[PDB]
Amino acid sequence: GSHLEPTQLGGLVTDQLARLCDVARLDRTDTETYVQTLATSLGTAAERSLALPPTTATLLSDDHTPVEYSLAFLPGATPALRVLVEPGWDSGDLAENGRAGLRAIRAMADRWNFSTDQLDLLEDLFFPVAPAGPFALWCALELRPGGVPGVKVYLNPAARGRDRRAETLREALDRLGHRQAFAALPPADDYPFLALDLGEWAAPRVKVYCTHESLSAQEAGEYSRGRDQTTDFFHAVAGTPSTRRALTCHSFTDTVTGRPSGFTLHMPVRSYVEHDGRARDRAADVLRRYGMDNDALDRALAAVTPRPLDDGVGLVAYVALVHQLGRDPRVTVYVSSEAYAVQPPR
Ligand SMILES: Cc1ccc2[nH]cc(C[C@H](N)C(=O)O)c2c1
Ligand SMILES: CC(C)=CCSP(=O)(O)OP(=O)(O)O
Numbered sequence: 001g002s003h004l005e006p007t008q009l010g011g012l013v014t015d016q017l018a019r020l021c022d023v024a025r026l027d028r029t030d031t032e033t034y035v036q037t038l039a040t041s042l043g044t045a046a047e048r049s050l051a052l053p054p055t056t057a058t059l060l061s062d063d064h065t066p067v068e069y070s071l072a073f074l075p076g077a078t079p080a081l082r083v084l085v086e087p088g089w090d091s092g093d094l095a096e097n098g099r100a101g102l103r104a105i106r107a108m109a110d111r112w113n114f115s116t117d118q119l120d121l122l123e124d125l126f127f128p129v130a131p132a133g134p135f136a137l138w139c140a141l142e143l144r145p146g147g148v149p150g151v152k153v154y155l156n157p158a159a160r161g162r163d164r165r166a167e168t169l170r171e172a173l174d175r176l177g178h179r180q181a182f183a184a185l186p187p188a189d190d191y192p193f194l195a196l197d198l199g200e201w202a203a204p205r206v207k208v209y210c211t212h213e214s215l216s217a218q219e220a221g222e223y224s225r226g227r228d229q230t231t232d233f234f235h236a237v238a239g240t241p242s243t244r245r246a247l248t249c250h251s252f253t254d255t256v257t258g259r260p261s262g263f264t265l266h267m268p269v270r271s272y273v274e275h276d277g278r279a280r281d282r283a284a285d286v287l288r289r290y291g292m293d294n295d296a297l298d299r300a301l302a303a304v305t306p307r308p309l310d311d312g313v314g315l316v317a318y319v320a321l322v323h324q325l326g327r328d329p330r331v332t333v334y335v336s337s338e339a340y341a342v343q344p345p346r
Contacts, residue, residue: 002039003047010039010046012339013067017083019303020069023296024081026145033147038083041104041139042066045090054340055090056097059134062270062314063341066090070140070334071300072322073292079300081143084154086135094131101137102127105153108139109198112148118204119153119196121175125168126155126194132162140195151198152207157191165191169208176204180258185250186223189213192247207262208250214243223248224263226323233321236289237267237282245271251324262324264332269319275345276301276309279316283333286319292331304335312342 004011014035021031039046045055045066054064061068066089071079087104088097102123109116127136135156142150157169169191173181176196190211197205212219217234221227238244244267251262273279280301287294305315318334 004039007050008046009048009050009339010042012050013065013337014039016069016304016337020081020300021143023079023300023303024143025078026081026143030143030145030147034143034149037141037149038067038085041085041087043087043090043100043104048090050339058086058089060084060086060138061317061336062343063336063338065337065339067337067339068317068334069304069337070332071297073287073331073333075291075328077293079293079296082140083143084138084140086138088136094133094136095129098127098131098136101139105137105139105198108151112151114151114199116198118176119198122155122172125172126159128160131159133158153196153198155194155196157194169194173206176206177255178204178206178252181206181208181252181260184258184260185210186248203255205253208252210248210250212246212248215246216243220246220265224265224323229329230265230321233265233286234267236286237269237319239272239282262322264320264322266318266320268317270314270317273313273346275311275313276315279313280309283316283319286331290329290331297333300335305338307342310345312344313346314343
């Protein structure tokens with residue numbers, strides 16, 4: 001029945017998620033299961049009045065909503081729906097934030113019957129006593145038909161200080177058995193995120209993110225080793241100056257070769273466009289050129305907010321091109337909740 005009112009954070013985001021579930025074509029049962037899961041995952045945040053300031057100035061979204069949606073488009077298919085949440089957001093400092101995030105993961109592990117052993121292995125690296133910013137733990141839920149979601153956990157390589165970012169990432173990869181993966185990463189300006197798949201995997205599967213402050217189309221293509229696709233995507237999303245801030249993501253699904261199995265180019269389109277009309281236009285063009293469901297993109301944006309796209313920027317937060325050995329390319333669009341603020345047109 002939902003103990004939440006549209007004036008509370010959880011009311012707003014569960015309404016958004018519910019409408020997104022319809023775009024994703026999930027039935028009523030799975031929709032109910034997943035909106036409840038989102039409400040539960042926010043903890044006390046769910047009943048917080050939206051009149052109050054965000055408890056934490058999280059990096060998760062620009063207006064500090066501890067929720068963000070993404071839609072993963074494969075050619076010829078309805079998009080798959082995922083949600084990113086910060087379970088410890090309604091806490092007073094980074095240590096408690098991380099304690100509460102871990103507590104949320106453990107409850108998910110219990111409910112859905114997977115092990116946290118590979119996460120537990122890393123706890124001293126990512127949850128020290130006096131953690132540094134900018135976040136402690138996020139969780140992404142892939143909202144799969146059947147009501148049992150895929151779970152991923154995001155961890156901060158800077159948790160023990162900016163000077164220990166590489167040392168912490170390297171030690172984590174070593175402990176997970178990926179002793180050659182670090183050598184496969186491109187040059188970078190930051191290692192902002194480490195993502196670990198949680199589920200039925202007898203060997204760890206990890207995603208290493210790299211920030212590139214001044215990435216060129218050609219460097220994007222070089223790092224993706226497929227190159228033409230990546231450079232074309234760069235221009236279309238970038239709207240092209242010859243460099244842009246972007247992130248690359250490098251997925252390692254085996255501990256044997258030291259080679260990644262996945263490459264993702266993540267482009268923060270919201271930093272390049274005047275307003276969300278321009279950002280939707282670029283995302284829709286990319287989807288159309290790949291045979292993906294560009295009409296569903298429009299319905300998903302309307303499911304999140306009725307506002308006109310040109311009235312702000314940042315609703316389309318990111319567009320990403322995902323390459324995975326053996327699979328079709330995928331395009332992911334990240335969509336903001338705007339529960340606290342709409343950023344004004346640029
Ligand atoms: C690479 C990437 C792709 C999709 C994302 N959704 C939320 C974040 C975190 C933060 N808002 C940021 O922009 O880093 C993020 C990061
Ligand atoms: C949300 C954050 C921090 C990064 C982008 S989420 P992701 O790249 O892991 O998306 P998938 O692994 O493709 O599901």
